[model samples]
Target: AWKGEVLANNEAGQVTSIIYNPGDVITIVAAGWASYGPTQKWGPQGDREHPDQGLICHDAFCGALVMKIGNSGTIPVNTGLFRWVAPNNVQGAITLIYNDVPGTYGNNSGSFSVNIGKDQS
Candidate 1:
């Protein structure tokens, strides 16, 4: 979970307590609002405005909730939900990041509470 007042302004993003081994099935459910500033705001899905270039979420909407497992590729969590299977090459902590232009997180506001769960067999 995230405290909008606090995590919203986190530039480096939050490293979750979750750890995943290779081939783990993971699910992430997120809800809440995020603001790039007073004039720009959106939910976990972001504003739906695609950027021209240089964004954390290249395939998803701008300002959306993105995820990274260890040093794996970034995954967009738009619409506040998605499922992912950990790659065979990755084994490390999960990091939640706000999708935004790099170095511009200082003006960002609000946060999203994301519930991440894993199932392994």
Candidate 2:
């Protein structure tokens, strides 16, 4: 658990996932975020065109993905932690995407992935 003060209270970061299994509940920390920057060929061309647009995707620098229960989404902003559950019968990337929000950048990591995977997850 994150037992500390709140820093960037309303800012998001980048996407970074680990091998997770169903029924796995874990604690997430801001320090683990992908951080500032992006791979040149990460997202659509238009994303790189925006200023303050740290990450890349179809959007300028915004990101959000509320993961579908079984599959429409895969990212929501709750506490800094979440539980992994098998939404649908399929299992793959369950790719939730976004570039970065107004406050920051993306990997579908807006403030944090899923429970907050807007600009960075």
Candidate 3:
């Protein structure tokens, strides 16, 4: 298990999603910009993107999976903190970063916990 906090909360900072093995318990703690809304602008380019975009979790190593969650549609807002359970014996870490231009912005991280064990069948 691991724990951390998101270092940034700029227009480009967000918490995508959490990933873990099947039956594994995953807990997350996060918070977004209070001044910002779900449809707030993000990125250094000043794009009219939603600050609450949903998270997506993929099977990959640290800083590899695409995890995001929140509202979904023309715009999306991410949940402050959420819990998720994997469906298989997957090995990877959650990624709470954006997909905007690199270097233009920094990656945001938050506190998370991961556990590995046999699925309760």
Candidate 4:
């Protein structure tokens, strides 16, 4: 589990994405999205349109720890952590599409390609 105040960063990977040992599970946590409200004139917020989007899911490693988005009001994932087992390094491309909630702020989406080969270390 993550430790410290506010819980903003992960203890696993500070710079780049954390690497998981084969069959390891990773957890992602979020506090809130108050800043994503559509009230702000010039601010960027989470997608407030598409519901059932993913919070920290991808198509690479069995998908996001939790599925669905843009529904819960600035809410956190059902659980603070998402689980996925490493599959032969689980190398592939994944998309994180933000939910399109009504009166959100912007269109939030992400595209990523991962390569988790055998760690020589």
Candidate 5:
């Protein structure tokens, strides 16, 4: 298990100490709020109406907390509201991404605290 924090404007997110393997079940619990701009603050769900605004994905919620395993594709973890299985090609450290348009984090603010664990079952 691992607990770590991430900044709203941090485009690269935070790398956790949790080492994951292919086919392993993983759970993440995240809380707190973050803002990509001064006008609004939101939970992990981010701007649901304009999901395409995020840099990570064309359909991803803007400013939502997303995850990436090694060089694997980004996953919208959403406040740690879900569980995931590592892909067969996925390995190495887990990267947390604060979803936002590239080069637009200059005015972002706040952070999120995350707890990650491997499902023992």
Candidate 6:
């Protein structure tokens, strides 16, 4: 499971995007934010409008996953890739934090894994 903290002060939460195997499942354990509303935001627009918001994970200008936190709670999400696309040479993970207290701005942190590779059984 991937773990991190959401550094937001207001009701608004954070979204994180990561690349994984077509059938890989993601488990998140986060705290320090106001709430936890983890949900995946897929498609190109996912990362387009929130350029200044936080880090986004995607390819070809399109996002494949998005995790959101609306209320202060723990999240456990499990889902599958919408379609089968060959893994790209680029693979990474992104972390987004919300700091919408009153004057503070949000922050995004991300890291790239090794080069993309086919899923192994």
Residue pairs whose backbone atoms clash in candidate 5: none
Worst 10 residues of 3 by lDDT: 57-66
Query: Model 6: per-residue lDDT, tens digit, 1-121?
Result: 3333333232233344444443443343322212112243232122333323222222212221223333222211212222334233322343333322223322322211111122333
lDDT of 4 by residue, 8-113 (tens): 1211111223434445555544333322223332111333342443333322111111222222122223224346443344432221222233333243222222
lDDT score at residue 30, model 1, on the 0-100 scale: 77
Best by TM-score: 5
The Cα local distance difference test for each model comes to 0.71, 0.32, 0.32, 0.28, 0.80, 0.29
TM-score of each model, in listed order: 0.81, 0.27, 0.35, 0.28, 0.88, 0.26
lDDT of 3 by residue, 1-121 (tens): 4444332333233333344434655554433332122333332112233332322212221222124322221111133223445444454434444323234233543222222222333
lDDT of 1 at 93: 81
lDDT of 5 by residue, 51-74 (tens): 465377544588788888888778
Query: Candidate 5 regions off by >4 Å?
Result: 81-83
Range of the 10 consecutive residues with the lowest summed lDDT in candidate 1: 1-10
Which structure is stronger by lDDT: 1 or 3?
Answer: 1
What ranges in model 2 sit over 4 Å off?
1-17, 31-72, 82-121
- Please provide, for model 1 over 1-121, each residue's C-alpha lDDT reduced to its tens digit, 9 standing for 90 to 100: 3232226577677888788787777777777888876676688887765553577768766678887778877777665444576445877887888877777778888888778777545
Which pairs clash in the backbone of model 1?
Answer: none
Best by lDDT: 5
Please report, as a residue range, the 10-residue window in candidate 6 with the lowest summed lDDT: 108-117
- RMSD per prediction, one decimal? 2.9, 11.7, 10.2, 11.8, 1.8, 12.3
